[PDB]
Structure formats: structure tokens, C-alpha cells
């Protein structure tokens, strides 16, 4: 269509190649197994590197040397025949090898299921035999002629049997004569009875051999007759001698072959329409396993029938050769060439082909020719796919060779190593250190990495400033680092953003744009507030740097990816540039009020006026800096620049506001005034100790009420204040600080008494081993709890350890107990607790045995961590693949469908208790209906963001359930609409019209995978994997299918649960329920003669998703899946808004399984898209309707991803060979429309700034401004 390519691509088609196509591609033939000569270091002729086939090896030159200049352009050499052109042509031209005998393609023969077996209706073993010269196949038979001659041939063979039996009977008459002769021979004298019986033994044993000769020789003819008369095509006869007898006796009436040519002949004499009709008949009728087999047979046959693609492409007559420059051969140090894997396989094929050609041409016995044809078949099979059948062809050192198939498959294959990832210029890498003087939009770049990243700009500016007359001098001056290159560089790098990236890039914020400022050293200086977003630390971490060049890239960096614009987590909406650790400690210390502090406010004592009332924060600062006042002391100041609180302002100023400049009296500490002076001017006074939660709330309110620049400035000021006041807080560690509980020994002795009593009871046989272990474990768990409580009580409130823990800076009190009080129980390598337990804290010093038994759990955790980091990436990749085509396309579909959120179910006694999990179920949603309470007016109008004010008003009105718009019910044909999706968590406003929400959902779900521990019912990452894969859970618990009472029965290893419906139509029953599983408690535990709902889960465990869909429909399975995934993630304290899971689930319920084909062409049991199914049914019903029938189906993410309409997106995900071989048979065309496909073909992705409405915007100066010029 477009030869090389050149853009304006419209479709990419794939299909089988016939011998004609393969011979048209080739520019020549390879018929000599010679690669390159050593003396002249030139390719040979008619080899794998010939310059007369693949192209010249030197630009505008000939192997002849006749023409070696551009003037001789386009002329084919008259001496050597090599065309004169550029050397790059060797990357394009291909050659072919003309096989002496037909060869089958291994993909369509060995790949399970065998696509030749279904096509020809032959078992895989029959193909294995016929193709590898071990059996004979009847390619043809003559029926009418042989039927006519059957009557005569019957009599002919009857006469021939007459000859056999009559010769036998005459020879037996001779045997009888010899028998009488022997009788007389031993009767002429006195012989022995054993002698007579011996002559009879010999003679009559050879007469029994006469009878057995009749038997065997005539059964030979009977077998010949039976085989010949009933023989039909596609019959395999072993014992070549039998076939030789058949052909010799009946040369005509049939034709038998052996090898790939036999299969080629069979395919040639094979009509497709008749077979398709026969299979359709067997499908419409018959039933049974025959119908199931006919379904697959018809799949393949209709695939080969619908298109103009003959099935004769499976048998090869020519073999294409890849261009040489894509399979080059290099030389090790010294000049010794090491062969590539492809070259060796090509050489083997060529050798075998030539030797077989010689053997056939010179004439030879059939055995030798057949053996050589088999050895050529094997070599050609190994070329395409080495190791599929038989032992892999191994090279030096016993390692299998890399075939042509290996180039396309695996993590090191073409796709996932070269098309989905690249090596890019204008990038570097170095270690990262903390720069506390930077700003959120700034980074520090060494003054030796910038000089290399920004080289061309520096050269341009040097030439412009007349520092270098030309480009070469500027280049060399840059390479020599003259003192002025730095002066020009500082100007060059100004206002040019830089992209920094840390691996692994779990989520979106792993790449952010900053502004470069040159620093001293060789490390990168990273602002402390982006570490959580990058998940970076300063113990040896490294990062990469990228530089966008073009104007669009710079605009994207400056607006989309700038760090100061990305403060909130896209997954949940919580801030990520919040202070942490040292900043939290400093602010927490600053905004504290310690009673009885220096300079504290004192009421009037009756002799002197009040002490501690100041007339301005300036005077308070003066007093503090004079040592008379403490920053953490309660004072009464007179504030005129801080806006008063809500209550104080309401009761003091009222009116409209405080109108900056007014004065009011505050009773607070100096530190809190200092802190509130950091917040925006209009923010009401905050008078509280700044726990991490309080700071988080302040930052979130700022984000949701103010512009983002205000938030950035506020966080920077808080950073400065915290880093200043952490140094003065006085937090250090010494063994004097690590206090020990005062009465640890008493508690340990008290519980050791109980342990001893349990041990003595065990000794007296009162309990077994497990009971003793359980009792000891409970005793020691209680002991550890008491020790921890005592330790918590003992510590003062200003201890550095307790201050750091309770400040929210980092850590938890379990570590404090381990350090000071006691470590307690430790786990065996199995996972069970050691009943000892460990009894010394790390302050005292564990003994040798305690340390050794601690090492077990110490190592098991690291091993599990490695396993989990391995497990999570696969799930993330699968999620990204399944839902990569979900993009916001419309502003509003104006539908009315919606879902209902629990939204604070009412209390029994009467009260509105808020549902704990409401932030991830109601916020950032738009109402699909109006909210009316107690016949009142609408509280919230349809189409409202439903934020904090809205939810608070709804709760105040007294309504528990509301209907909201969701992606599960969007009515857009392709993609979701903005209103159904709702608010964008990162931006805080309605999502844009080019938002790729599928990838955001995938990264949000997969990023907190390592945190989610991998801990017989699955309860972690395996549980998530089986939920998203829609597999049978494990502890599958039956679910009712019709409401009714149950006659519960009790038995060992089985429980009979019968569904007695209220209607009484029929009773379902399950008797295989093992006694190990419990009975679920619904409404009291499940009991005999108890009515149950339709979807109630009788037993305990996990329900299978495929049955709830059958019983309760799609909505119920959707809510079930969302609830299960949310439960799994909440168990580990991770918050993910339900819209991401809703996107993922929506991508899993998108098809319908077909039942009745009707006038429609859908085959029974196939998975068909719902939109296409409905469209086809509606089209058909117009004209004498015979609509097809379908049912909802649930698919896993892997199947849903491999059932794509693009054969290029599925081949880059998994199972490249199977996808390619099926697509080639179905002759699928790829309409390139998607993120992955456009990335692969190097075209703008259809999302974000690549949509038509954005990429095709027009700009011009205004008329007024144009005139003002």
C-alpha cells in the first residue's frame, strides 16, 4: 500500500504468504553455505551475504571495482552484476532458498491446537507420522471404476484363493503319502511307539505348518482384499511391506504418498464449502461431544473460507532470508568471527537442501531420499522455531540457538525491549542529596552535567556573542571549559525546565518538572518536599534527568508536569508536598503551650497590674530575644494583622469582617502567632498544636479554597519554619533517654508462674502439645501487653523518643516497646510462634539463642518482600493492558442511569451515624437525581460535585441514600463522559475531555502493592489477583438461587443443604459441602428449616463471581467485585477512590456469550461485543427478523486483553506466537487507534494534548492589539 511507509498510515494488515509472495520479495537466491571469506574479508557469491542480492557493502562501489564513484549511479555492473547504490540497502533486501522438497510450517502443525489437524481432520500423531516419513496416507481412491470392477475382482481373487488352497491340499496329499511312508519305514522292523509318535510329531507338525500356511498366507490375501475394497482417502497404513503388497497387486485404483507433499496433495484435493456446510449441519443437529469438536473445526474452516486465503500457505516451497545487516557477524579481539545463531541455522538448511538435491538428481534408493527429506524438514522446523519439537539444536557449550521466533517473544524480544521503550539522548544520572534552600519548583544541577546536557545552546550563544567565529571553535571551547562558557551557560539554562525521574516509576508523580540552578559538586540537589512523591531517600539513591527540546515539550513541562502544580495525590486527593519528619517535629514543638513557662501571663495579684500582656508581636519578640519570655508560654497579645477566629470575629466585629488594620486581643503563645503569620493573610487564626493530622487538614483546606501558588508558598514557609525550629527543640538519643519500666521483673515473674503451671498441667497429661502451645502463647501475649502498658505510662511527655512518635513524625510505639520494654513472641520458619518467648529488649542485649531464633522471622520477611515486589509488577502491567482504552470523550451523555451509595445508614435507636468509608464512595461524584427529604424541597440539585458542604447538608436534611453518576452506567459508545466520571482527584475540578483515566486507575490500584502484604482463604495480593482474574476463588461457598427454607442435614465430610422454594417448583441441593467449612451467620447461624434470600451465601468463604452474575445480574457482580477489592485494600490501610476500581470492573463486563446464531453469523458459544451484537440484531430484525440470542459473560483481565481487535497490541502483551498465527489465518486488519499502537508506530497518542480539538487550535493577535502595533 505504501511500500516503505511514510505517514498517512490507515491500516496494518497481516496474512499468510504464498510461495509467489516469497519469491517476489526476494532479490535473489541463496544456494551456497558460505558466509564470508577470511583472506579477502569479503562476502562470497550466492551465500548469505552476497552483494549481488542484498546490496552493496560500500556506498557507490562494486565488488568488481569497475565503478567506484557517484557518477556511476543506477547502472548495474556489467562484470559482477552488482547494482550501484548506497550501502543502507542491505537493511531492506531479502533473499530466498528454493527448497528441493515441500516443507510444512511448524507453527500450523505443532502449535497446540494443531491447525492442520482440524483443517484436514487428522490427529496430531497422524501428522507427526506422515510428515516425518513413518506412515503412508491414501491421497486418492477411485470409487466408481473400482466399484464396477469389484464383481469381477471378487471372482478373480476367489480363483486365486482356489490356487492357494488347492496347492496346500495337494501338498498335504503328498504329506499323507510321506506319512504312510514313515509308518511303513518304522513298521518294516521293531520300532518304538515314541518313534512312531516322533515321525508323526515332525511330519504332522509340518502339516500343522501346512494348515498354518493356509491360515497365514490366505489371511494375507483376505487382508489385502478388505483393505483394498474399503480403502478411502485419509487412511494411514503402517508396515510399509503391506503398502508395497497393496500397490504391487493394485497399482491403480488409488494413489499413496508420504511426507509434506502428501499433505500438500490432500489440501489441493479439498473443497472448503462442502466441509463448512457439513460442520454447520453437525452443529445445528447431532449434539454431544461431536458438536463440541465441530465447533472448533468450523472455527478454523470458516476462518479459511470467509477470506480469499487458501490453506496452501502452510506447506512451503521457498524460505525467505532476512537481510544481512539485521543478522550481522562480528569478530572478537584479534579478528576471529563468531557466527550468529541465525546464520548457523540457515547454513544447516542450505547444506541439507543441497545434499538432498544431489541425492535425488543422481538417483538413489527410496530410504536415503526419505531420510534426507526428513532431515531437511527438521532443519527447516528448527530454523523457524528451535526446540518446539524434539531436542533443541544446540551450539557450542550445549546451549540452544536463538531462532527467528525468539526474536519476537519474551521480555527481551523486539516489542518489550525496543518498541515500548527506548534509549534517549539529552539525559544523565547522578546521586541525589538534599538541598534545603531550594524552592518547590527548583532543583540543583551540578555545573558539569548541565554543560553537557545544554551543549548546543551554549555553542549557539557563544557564536552569537562573538566569543567564537564559527561552530567548530565554539565546540572546542566548550570541550576545553574556558572561564566564559560558565557565564554564558548561566544565561542559557535560565527558564528552561528539566524532567527528573526515579526508578521504579510506580505512579504518575514519579516524573516531575523543575527549574535548574547550577550548584557546586557532582550530586543532584532535590527539594525535601518531593521525596514522598518520588519515594526517594538519601542513602545511595540515584535519579535520571531529561531535557525537553521543542516548544510543545517545554510548554508541557511548564504547565502539565511542573512540581508546584502537582501537590495532591491523583489516587486519593491527599496532599503529597506536606511536611514530614524534621519539619513536623519543629512545627509541633513550636506550636506548643507548656504550663508554668518563663514569662507566663499572670493575673493581677492585688498589688501589681497584669503581667504578660503585650502591645504587639514585635514587643513579644523583643522580650523573647531578651530571655524574659518563652516562645511556648501563654501570653496575651494585641493582634492587628491576623484575622480573628470565626466565633471571636462574629461576637466582636460582626458586620462583614475584620477589614485588615483593626485590632483584637488574643490569648495564645508566641509560637502560635509566629506560625499563623506563615499562613495566608485571610485565613482565620489557628490556635492549636500542629499534629501531622492538623497540618494535613490545613493544607487540604488551603488547596480546596485557594489557588495552588498560595499552597506552594505556604508549604515552603512551613518547611523553613520547621527546619529552623527542629534544631532548637532538643531531640537526641542516649541510653539515659531510653527509660525502662520500673516493675518489669515483677510482671515477668508473675506470668512465668502461669507458664510453669501450664507446663506442669501438660506434664500431668491434662492437655496435649497444641493446647499447651496455645495457652503459653496467650499467657505471653498478655505479658507483652502489660509490659507495653507499663512502659507507656512511665515515660514523661517531653522525652525525645515519645515526642517523635506522638508528633506524627515517624515510627510507632511497638518499636518503642521493643527497644525499651520487651520484644516478646517470635515466629518459626513455618509461621507459628515460638512459645519461649524472647524476653530481653534491644537496650539490655539479647542472648545468643534469642538472637538466633529472631533471625528466622528476620529473614523470612526479606524473602517475602522480594517475592512481593516480583508479584506486584505483573499485576500492574496486566491492569494497564486491560484498561488502556478508557478515555474521557464527551462532556455529558445526559443519561439517567446511576448507582446508590450507602451514605451513612441510620442507627437503630435513631441517629445519623456517618459511614466510615464515605470519602471513597460519595465524594467526587455527581448526582443523577434530586435529593428530597420529608416532602421538602430539593436539597441538592442534579449535577452537583457533592463535596463536603453538599454531604453535610444532605446528612442534616436526614437522607441516607442518594443516586450518583458512575462510569459503570455511562451511555457513551466509546469511552466515558466527564460528568459520569466526576471530579478529578489531582486537579480537584471536573475531569478534562482528554483525560486518560484508565492508566490513572491502573497506577492507583497497583502502586500500593508492596505495602499490601502477601499474607486457606487468600487475603492479600493473591486475593486481588484472583478477584481481577475472575477465577474460582478457592473456598468457594455455595449461594442460593431461589428464596426458600432449607432442610439442613448433619453428616461427616458432607452437609446436605436443600433449597425449598416458597413457590415449591423444584428443590436445588448441595450435599458435597465439607464439614471443615463453617456456616455463615446471616440475619443467627444457618439452621435447619430457615428461609433464606436469593443471593444469601449459605457457607463461609468467598463466592465465585460467575454465579452471582448468573443469579443476580451485572449490577450485583459489579458491587460485589468493588466491595471485595476495597475490603482487601482497606485491611492494609490504603485509601483508593472506588472510581478506579469501577473503571477496571467496567472493562471486565463488556461482552455477551452467544447461544443461537440465527440469520446472524455469530457462532454459538462465542464471545461478542455487546454493541456489535445489538447493532447486528437490530439490523437483522428489520428484514424478516431472526435475531441471535446472548447472555452476559464475565472475563478476566488477561482474556479481556487478549480478546482485543488489534493484533498488534495483543502480540506485545503475551503469547506472541499464538496471536500471530491466529491473526495470519484470520487475515485481520489493524485500524491503528490506541495508546500502545500509536506509541509503537511513532504517532501522537489520541489523548490529552493529542486530541483534535486541542492539537488543531488556531492563534492570532487581536485586531485592537494588531492596530496598537
Partner DNA sequence: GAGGGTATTCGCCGCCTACCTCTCCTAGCCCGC
Partner DNA sequence: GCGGGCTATGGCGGCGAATACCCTC
Partner RNA sequence: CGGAGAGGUA
Contact 627, 650 (CB under 8 A): no
The site for DNA, by CB under 7 A, has a size of: 39
532 near Mg ion, rule: CB under 5 A: no
The breaks in the chain (C to N more than 2.5 Å) occur after: 1015, 1083
Strand 498-501 relative to strand 542-546, pairing? antiparallel
Question: Can residue 968 be called a binding residue for Zn ion (CB under 5 A)?
Answer: no
Applying CB under 7 A, does 537 fall inside the site for RNA?
Answer: yes
Q: Total number of residues binding Mg ion (CB under 5 A)?
A: 3
Residue 539 marked ligand-binding: yes
Residue environment code for 629-638, b if the CB has 16+ CB neighbours within 10 A, otherwise e: bbbbbbbebe
Does residue number 862 form part of the binding site for RNA (CB under 7 A)? no
Contact yes or no for 39/1255 (Cβ under 8 A): no
- Residue 1173 has a CB neighbour count (10 Å cut-off) of 21
Q: Residue 409 binds what, of RNA, Mg ion, DNA, none (CB under 5 to 8 Å, by partner type)?
A: DNA
970 in contact with Zn ion (CB under 5 A): yes
Which residue's Cβ has the minimum distance to Mg ion? 537
The Cα 356–Cα 871 span in angstroms is 51
- Strand 1167-1169 to strand 1190-1193: parallel, antiparallel, or no bridges (unpaired)? unpaired
Nearest distance from residue 573's CB to RNA, in Å?
A: 27
x-marked contacts with DNA along 840-869 as a string, rule CB under 7 A: --------------------------x--x
> Choosing among DNA, Zn ion, Mg ion, none, which partner's interface includes residue 79 (Cβ < 5 to 8 Å by kind)?
Zn ion
- Other residues' Cβ atoms within 10 Å of the Cβ of residue 221: 15
Give the distance, in angstroms, between the CA of residue 521 and the centroid of all CA atoms in the same chain. Answer: 40
List 174, 503, 560, 628, residue binding DNA (CB under 7 A): 503
Cα–Cα distance, 395 to 854 (Å, whole number): 49
Shortest Cβ distance from residue 333 to RNA (Å)?
8
Task: Choose which of 65, 202, 328, 504 interacts with DNA (CB under 7 A).
Answer: 504
Pick the closer one to Mg ion by CB: 439 or 502: 502
Q: Determine contact, residues 1004/985, Cβ cutoff 8 Å.
A: no
- Return the one option of RNA, Zn ion, Mg ion, none that residue 576 interacts with (CB less than 5 to 8 A, by type): none
Look at residue 682 and give the partner it binds from Mg ion, DNA, Zn ion, none, a contact being a CB closer than 5 to 8 Å depending on partner kind: none
Residues numbered 302 to 331 that lie near RNA (CB under 7 A) are 330
Overall residue count recorded for the chain in this entry? 1269
Binding residue for DNA (CB under 7 A) from 190, 288, 661, 910? 288
> Longest Cα pair distance anywhere in the chain, in angstroms?
171
Query: Is 402 a binder of DNA (CB under 7 A)?
Result: no
Side-chain half-sphere CA neighbours of 1137 within 13 A: 25
Window of 535-543, 621-629, 699-707, 741-749 that interacts with Mg ion by CB under 5 A = 535-543
Q: How far apart are CA 329 and CA 337, in angstroms?
A: 7
The site that binds RNA (CB under 7 A) totals a number of residues, namely: 11
Contact positions with RNA (CB under 7 A) in 764-823: none
Rounded to a whole number of angstroms, the minimum distance from the CB of residue 537 to RNA is: 6
> For 330, phi and psi rounded to 5 degrees?
-110, 170
Q: Is 112 in the site for DNA (CB under 7 A)?
A: yes
Judged by CB under 7 A, the residue of 152, 285, 289, 469 near DNA is: 289
166 labelled ligand-binding? no
Min CB(1174)–DNA separation in Å: 26
Q: Which does 288 bind (CB under 5 to 8 A by kind): RNA, DNA, Zn ion, none?
A: DNA
Q: Which residue bears the cell 477496571?
A: 1144
Scanning residues 490 to 509, which ones bind RNA (CB under 7 A)?
A: 503-504
Instruction: Give the rounded distance of the alpha carbon of 511 from its chain centre.
Output: 21
Residues 988-1047 contacting DNA, CB under 7 A: 1029, 1031-1032, 1034
Tell me if 871 contacts RNA by CB under 7 A: no
Q: Retrieve residue 161's grid coordinates.
A: 484363493
**Nearest distance from C-beta of residue 978 to Zn ion, angstroms:** 8
Q: How far is the CB of 1084 from Mg ion (least distance, A)?
A: 54
Cα Rg, the chain, nearest whole Å: 43
Over the window 980 to 1019, marking each residue x when it contacts Zn ion by CB under 5 A and - when it does not, the resulting string is x---------------------------------------
| Distance in angstroms (rounded) separating the CA atoms of residues 514 and 497 | 6
* Cβ 1062 to DNA shortest distance, Å: 30
Residue in 196, 280, 388, 402 binding DNA, rule: CB under 7 A: 388
CA gap 749, 778 in Å, rounded: 16
Question: Residue 531 annotated as binding?
Answer: no
Per-residue CA distances from 1254 to 206, 910, 1259, 1267 (Å): 102, 53, 12, 28
Site for RNA in 330-359 (CB under 7 A): 330, 332, 338
User: Looking at residue 1018, what DSSP letter applies?
Assistant: -
Whole-number Å distance between alpha carbons of 865 and 777 = 26
For residues 483 and 540, which CB has a smaller minimum distance to RNA in the complex? 540
Question: By rule CB under 5 A, what string of x and - marks binding of each residue 537-566 to Mg ion?
Answer: x-x-x-------------------------
Q: How far is CA 138 from the centre of its chain?
A: 49
Backbone dihedral region of 288: left (phi > 0), alpha (psi from -120 to 50 degrees) or beta?
Answer: left
If one asks whether residue 1169 binds DNA (CB under 7 A), the answer comes out as no
For residue 834, give the 3-state DSSP assignment: strand
CA angle 268, 270, 275 (to 5 degrees): 160
Sign of CA dihedral 604, 608, 613, 615: positive
Report if residue 867 touches RNA, rule: CB under 7 A: no
Return the one option of Zn ion, DNA, RNA, none that residue 1029 interacts with (CB less than 5 to 8 A, by type): DNA
Task: Show the site string, 68-97: x = touches Zn ion by CB under 5 A, - = not.
Answer: ---------x-xx-----------------
Q: Which does 114 bind (CB under 5 to 8 A by kind): Zn ion, DNA, Mg ion, none?
A: DNA
Q: Are 1082 and 1037 in contact (CB under 8 A)?
A: no
The item of DNA, RNA, Mg ion, none sharing an interface with residue 289, based on CB under 5 to 8 Å by kind, is: DNA
Q: Residue 399 interacts with RNA (CB under 7 A)?
A: yes
Rounded to a whole number of angstroms, the minimum distance from the CB of residue 432 to RNA is 9
In the three-class reduction of DSSP (H, G, I as helix; E, B as strand; rest coil), residue 500 is classed as strand
1021 with 872: CB under 8 angstroms?
A: yes
As given in the structure block, the three cell numbers for residue 761 are 498441667
**If you write DSSP's letter for every residue of 616-633 in order, what string do you get?**
-HHHHHHHHHTTSS-TTS
Taking a C-beta distance cutoff of 8 angstroms, is the pair 690, 737 a contact?
no
Find the binder of DNA among 196, 1218, 1241, 1250 (CB under 7 A).
1218
CA–CA dist 288, 1211 (Å, integer): 35
Task: State the cell numbers at 1097.
Answer: 451465601
- How many helices and strands (H and E) does the chain possess? 44, 30
The region that residue 1053 occupies, defined by phi over 0 for left and psi between -120 and 50 for alpha, beta otherwise, is left
Question: For residue 358, what is the DSSP state?
Answer: H
Cβ 510 to DNA shortest distance, Å: 11
In the complex, least distance from residue 1171 CB atom to DNA, rounded to whole angstroms: 25
The contact set with Zn ion (CB under 5 A) reads 62, 64, 66, 77, 79-80, 893, 970, 977, 980
The contact set with DNA (CB under 7 A) reads 38, 112-114, 117, 123-125, 288-290, 296, 332, 338, 388, 396-397, 409-411, 416, 421, 429, 503-504, 866, 869-870, 872-874, 1029, 1031-1032, 1034, 1214-1215, 1217-1218
Residues of the binding site: 62, 64, 77, 80, 537, 539, 541, 893, 970, 977, 980
Residues of the binding site for Mg(2+): 537, 539, 541
Residues of the binding site for Zn(2+): 62, 64, 77, 80, 893, 970, 977, 980
The contact set with RNA (CB under 7 A) reads 330, 332, 338, 399, 503-504, 537, 539-542
Amino acid at each position: 500500500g505504501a511500500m516503505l511507509d511514510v505517514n498517512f498510515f490507515d491500516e496494518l494488515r497481516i496474512g499468510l504468504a504464498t510461495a509467489e509472495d516469497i519469491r517476489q520479495w526476494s532479490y535473489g537466491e541463496v544456494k551456497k553455505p558460505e558466509t564470508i571469506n577470511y583472506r579477502t574479508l569479503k562476502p562470497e557469491k550466492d551465500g548469505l551475504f552476497c552483494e549481488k542480492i542484498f546490496g552493496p557493502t560500500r556506498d557507490w562501489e562494486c565488488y568488481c571495482g569497475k565503478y567506484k564513484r557517484v557518477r556511476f549511479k543506477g547502472i548495474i555492473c556489467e562484470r559482477c552484476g552488482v547494482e550501484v547504490t548506497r550501502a543502507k540497502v542491505r537493511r531492506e533486501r531479502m533473499g530466498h532458498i528454493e527448497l528441493a522438497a515441500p516443507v510444512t510450517h511448524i507453527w500450523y502443525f505443532k502449535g497446540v491446537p494443531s491447525r492442520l489437524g482440524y483443517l484436514l481432520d487428522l490427529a496430531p500423531k497422524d501428522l507427526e507420522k506422515i510428515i516425518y516419513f513413518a506412515a503412508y496416507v491414501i491421497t486418492s481412491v477411485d470409487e466408481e471404476m473400482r466399484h464396477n470392477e469389484l464383481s469381477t475382482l471378487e471372482a478373480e481373487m476367489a480363483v486365486e484363493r482356489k490356487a492357494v488352497e488347492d496347492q496346500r491340499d495337494g501338498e498335504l496329499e503328498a504329506r499323507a503319502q510321506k506319512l504312510e511312508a514313515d509308518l511303513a519305514e518304522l513298521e518294516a522292523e521293531g520300532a518304538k511307539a515314541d518313534a512312531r509318535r516322533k515321525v508323526r510329531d515332525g511330519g504332522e507338525r509340518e502339516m500343522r505348518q501346512i494348515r498354518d500356511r493356509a491360515q497365514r498366507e490366505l489371511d494375507r490375501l483376505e487382508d489385502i482384499w478388505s483393505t483394498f475394497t474399503k480403502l478411502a482417502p485419509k487412511q494411514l497404513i503402517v508396515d510399509e511391506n503391506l503398502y508395497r503388497e497393496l500397490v504391487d497387486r493394485y497399482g491403480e485404483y488409488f494413489t499413496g504418498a508420504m511426507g509434506a507433499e502428501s499433505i500438500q496433495k490432500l489440501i489441493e484435493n479439498f473443497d472448503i464449502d462442502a466441509e463448512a456446510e457439513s460442520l454447520r449441519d453437525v452443529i445445528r443437529n447431532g449434539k454431544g461431544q461431536k458438536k463440541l469438536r465441530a465447533l472448533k473445526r468450523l472455527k478454523v474452516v470458516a476462518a479459511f473460507q470467509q477470506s480469499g486465503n487458501s490453506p496452501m500457505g502452510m506447506v512451503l516451497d521457498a524460505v525467505p532470508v532476512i537481510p544481512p545487516e539485521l543478522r550481522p557477524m562480528v569478530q572478537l579481539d584479534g579478528g576471529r568471527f563468531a557466527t550468529s545463531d541465525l546464520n548457523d541455522l540457515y547454513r544447516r538448511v542450505i547444506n541439507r537442501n543441497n545434499r538432498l538435491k544431489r541425492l535425488i538428481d543422481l538417483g538413489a534408493p527410496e530410504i536415503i531420499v526419505n531420510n534426507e527429506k526428513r532431515m531437511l524438514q527438521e532443519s527447516v522446523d528448527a530454523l523457524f522455531d528451535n526446540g518446539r519439537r524434539g531436542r533443541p539444536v544446540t551450539g557450542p557449550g550445549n546451549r540452544p540457538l536463538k531462532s527467528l521466533s525468539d526474536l519476537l517473544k519474551g521480555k527481551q524480544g523486539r516489542f518489550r525491549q525496543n518498541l515500548l521503550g527506548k534509549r534517549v539522548d539529552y539525559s544523565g544520572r547522578s546521586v541525589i542529596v538534599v538541598g534545603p534552600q531550594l524552592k518547590l519548583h527548583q532543583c540543583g544541577l551540578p555545573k558539569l552535567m548541565a554543560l553537557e546536557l545544554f551543549k548546543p545552546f551554549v555553542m549557539k550563544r557563544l557564536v552569537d556573542l562573538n566569543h567564537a567565529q564559527n561552530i567548530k571553535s565554539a565546540k572546542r571551547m566548550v570541550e576545553r571549559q574556558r572561564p566564559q562558557v560558565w557565564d554564558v551557560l548561566e544565561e542559557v539554562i535560565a527558564e528552561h525546565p528539566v524532567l527528573l525521574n526515579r526508578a521504579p516509576t510506580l505512579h504518575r508523580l514519579g516524573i516531575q518538572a523543575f527549574e535548574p540552578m547550577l550548584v557546586e559538586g557532582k550530586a543532584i540537589q532535590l527539594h525535601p518536599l518531593v521525596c514522598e512523591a518520588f519515594n526517594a531517600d538519601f542513602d545511595g539513591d540515584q535519579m535520571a534527568v531529561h531535557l525537553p527540546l521543542s516548544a510543545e515539550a517545554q510548554a508541557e513541562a511548564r504547565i502539565l508536569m511542573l512540581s508546584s502544580n502537582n501537590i495532591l495525590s491523583p489516587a486519593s486527593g491527599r496532599p503529597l508536598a506536606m511536611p514530614r519528619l524534621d519539619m513536623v517535629t519543629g512545627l509541633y514543638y513550636l506550636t506548643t503551650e507548656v504550663p508554668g513557662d518563663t514569662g507566663e501571663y499572670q493575673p493581677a495579684s492585688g498589688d501589681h497590674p497584669e503581667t504578660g500582656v503585650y502591645s504587639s508581636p514585635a514587643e513579644a519578640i523583643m522580650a523573647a530575644d531578651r530571655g524574659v519570655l518563652s516562645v511556648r508560654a501563654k501570653i496575651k497579645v494585641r493582634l492587628t494583622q491576623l484575622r480573628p477566629p470565626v466565633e471571636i470575629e462574629a461576637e466582636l466585629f460582626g458586620h462583614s469582617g475584620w477589614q485588615p488594620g483593626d485590632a483584637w486581643m488574643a490569648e495564645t503563645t508566641l509560637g502560635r502567632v509566629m506560625f499563623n503569620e506563615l499562613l495566608p493573610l485571610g485565613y482565620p487564626f489557628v490556635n492549636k498544636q500542629m499534629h501531622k493530622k492538623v497540618q494535613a487538614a490545613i493544607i487540604n483546606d488551603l488547596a480546596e479554597r485557594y489557588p495552588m501558588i498560595v499552597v506552594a508558598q505556604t508549604v515552603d514557609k512551613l518547611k523553613d519554619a520547621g527546619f529552623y525550629w527542629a534544631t532548637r527543640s532538643g531531640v537526641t538519643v542516649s541510653m539515659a533517654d531510653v527509660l525502662v519500666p520500673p516493675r518489669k521483673k515483677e510482671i515477668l515473674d508473675h506470668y512465668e508462674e502461669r507458664a510453669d503451671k501450664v507446663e506442669k498441667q501438660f506434664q500431668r497429661g491434662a492437655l496435649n502439645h497444641d493446647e499447651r502451645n496455645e495457652a503459653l502463647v496467650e499467657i505471653w501475649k498478655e505479658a507483652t501487653d502489660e509490659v507495653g502498658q507499663a512502659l507507656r505510662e512511665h515515660y514523661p511527655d517531653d522525652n525525645p523518643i515519645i515526642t517523635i512518635v506522638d508528633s506524627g513524625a515517624t515510627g510507632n510505639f511497638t518499636q518503642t516497646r521493643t527497644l525499651a520494654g520487651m520484644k516478646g513472641l517470635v515466629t518459626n520458619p513455618k509461621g507459628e510462634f515460638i512459645p519461649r518467648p524472647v524476653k530481653s529488649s534491644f537496650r539490655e542485649g539479647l542472648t545468643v539463642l534469642e538472637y538466633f531464633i529472631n533471625t528466622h522471622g528476620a529473614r523470612k520477611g526479606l524473602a517475602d518482600t522480594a517475592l512481593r515486589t516480583a508479584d506486584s509488577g505483573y499485576l500492574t502491567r496486566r491492569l494497564v493492558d486491560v484498561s488502556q482504552d478508557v478515555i474521557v470523550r464527551e462532556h455529558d451523555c445526559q443519561t439517567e442511569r446511576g448507582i446508590v451509595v450507602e451514605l451513612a445508614e441510620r442507627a437503630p435507636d435513631g441517629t445519623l451515624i456517618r459511614d466510615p468509608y464515605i470519602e471513597t464512595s460519595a465524594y467526587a461524584r455527581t448526582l443523577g437525581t434530586d435529593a428530597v427529604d420529608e416532602a421538602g424541597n430539593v436539597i441538592v440539585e442534579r449535577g452537583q460535585d457533592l463535596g463536603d458542604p453538599e454531604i453535610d447538608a444532605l446528612l442534616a436534611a436526614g437522607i441516607t441514600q442518594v443516586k450518583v453518576r458512575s462510569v459503570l452506567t455511562c451511555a457513551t459508545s466509546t469511552g466515558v463522559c466527564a460528568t459520569c466520571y466526576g471530579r478529578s482527584m489531582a486537579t480537584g475540578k471536573l475531569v478534562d475531555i482528554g483525560e486518560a483515566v484508565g492508566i490513572v486507575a491502573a497506577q492507583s490500584i497497583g502502586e500500593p502493592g508492596t505495602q499490601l502484604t502477601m499474607r486457606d482463604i487468600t487475603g492479600g495480593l493473591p486475593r486481588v489477583q484472583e478477584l481481577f482474574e475472575a477465577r474460582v476463588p478457592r473456598g468457594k461457598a455455595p449461594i442460593a438461587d431461589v428464596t426458600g427454607r432449607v432442610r439442613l442435614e448433619d453428616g461427616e465430610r458432607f452437609y446436605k443443604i436443600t433449597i425449598v422454594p416458597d413457590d415449591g417448583g423444584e428443590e436445588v441441593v448441595y450435599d458435597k459441602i465439607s464439614k471443615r467449612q463453617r456456616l455463615r451467620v446471616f440475619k443467627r447461624v444457618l439452621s435447619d428449616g430457615d428461609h433464606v434470600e436469593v443471593g444469601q451465601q449459605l457457607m463461609e468463604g468467598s463466592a465465585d463471581p460467575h454465579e452471582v452474575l448468573r443469579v443476580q445480574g451485572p449490577r450485583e457482580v459489579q458491587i460485589h467485585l468493588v466491595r471485595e477489592v476495597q475490603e482487601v485494600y482497606r485491611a492494609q490501610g490504603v485509601s483508593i477512590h472506588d472510581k478506579h476500581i469501577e473503571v477496571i470492573v467496567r472493562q471486565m463486563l463488556r461482552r455477551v456469550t452467544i447461544i443461537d446464531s440465527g440469520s446472524t453469523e455469530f457462532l454459538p458459544g462465542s464471545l461478542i461485543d455487546r454493541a456489535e451484537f445489538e447493532a447486528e440484531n437490530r439490523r437483522v430484525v428489520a428484514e424478516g427478523g431472526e435475531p441471535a440470542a446472548g447472555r452476559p459473560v464475565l472475563m478476566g483481565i488477561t482474556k479481556a486483553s487478549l480478546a482485543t481487535d488489534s493484533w498488534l497490541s495483543a502480540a506485545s502483551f503475551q503469547e506472541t506466537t499464538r496471536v500471530l498465527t491466529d491473526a495470519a489465518i484470520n487475515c485481520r486488519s489493524d485500524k491503528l487507534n490506541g495508546l500502545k499502537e500509536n506509541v509503537i508506530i511513532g504517532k501522537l497518542i489520541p489523548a490529552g494534548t493529542g486530541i483534535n480539538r486541542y492539537r488543531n487550535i488556531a492563534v492570532q493577535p487581536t485586531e485592537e492589539a494588531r492596530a496598537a502595533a
